[PDB]
């Protein structure tokens, strides 16, 4: 699904870049033709601004999908790294809490000795 979505958006991102480049070229040519002496049709034109925001929207959607997948994969690998299941989670949380107590003790002592 996260890999699948990344595949789905990539053709769209290429399409959005193509339109944004083409629309920019049409707008610049019309503006140069109006600024210099050169007749040009009013036409549909299509605004450059609308295309540039669309490209940014697709970029955010892709980054959000990848960031979630990376976070989910990182959490899974860490979970694997660390008889009944309730006692299992109990001893895990107990080890983590005792490590945190050691942390707090070292911190408070090293901060009370000086500074």
């Amino acid at each position: 699904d996260p890999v699948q979505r990344y595949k789905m958006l990539i053709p769209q991102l290429k399409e959005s870049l193509q339109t944004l480049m083409k629309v920019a070229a049409q707008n610049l040519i019309q503006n140069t033709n109006i600024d210099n002496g050169q007749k040009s049709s009013d036409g549909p034109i299509q605004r450059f601004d609308k295309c540039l925001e669309e490209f940014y929207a697709l970029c955010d959607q892709l980054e959000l999908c990848l960031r979630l997948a990376h976070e989910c994969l990182s959490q899974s690998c860490d979970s694997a790294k660390h008889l009944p299941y309730p006692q299992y989670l109990a001893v895990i949380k107990a080890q983590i809490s005792c490590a945190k107590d050691i942390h707090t003790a070292l911190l408070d002592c090293a901060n009370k000795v000086t500074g």
């Binding site: 070292l106 000086t114 500074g115």
Partner: protein, 102 residues
């Protein structure tokens, strides 16, 4: 001002990252704090060496007392070592005298 205070603050700062309520950040942080701690430690060592040089060049008698104490300690250590060696030698002499028999 009291380089002791500055070295204490650097030793606190070397712990100021973990003791609080990816890899590149901790990397550069430990680089900076460790190098600062090393520089200030080498500076305090330099100050102590300067004080030693001054006291030795202007008051060369306490160094002589230090040499006397060190030589006496060396002699005592040598005597203790030779005593232990003699004890082991006498033990092994008795052990060998026990054997060799028929």
């Amino acid at each position: 001002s009291t380089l002791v205070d500055e070295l204490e603050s650097s030793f606190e700062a070397c712990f100021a990252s973990l003791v609080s309520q990816d890899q590149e950040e901790i990397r550069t942080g430990v680089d900076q704090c460790i190098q600062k701690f090393l520089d200030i430690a080498r500076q305090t060592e330099c100050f102590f060496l300067q004080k030693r040089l001054q006291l030795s060049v202007q008051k060369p008698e306490q160094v002589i007392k230090e040499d006397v104490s060190e030589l006496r300690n060396e002699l005592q250590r040598k005597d203790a070592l030779v005593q232990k060696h003699l004890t082991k030698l006498r033990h092994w002499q008795q052990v060998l005298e026990d054997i060799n028999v028929q």
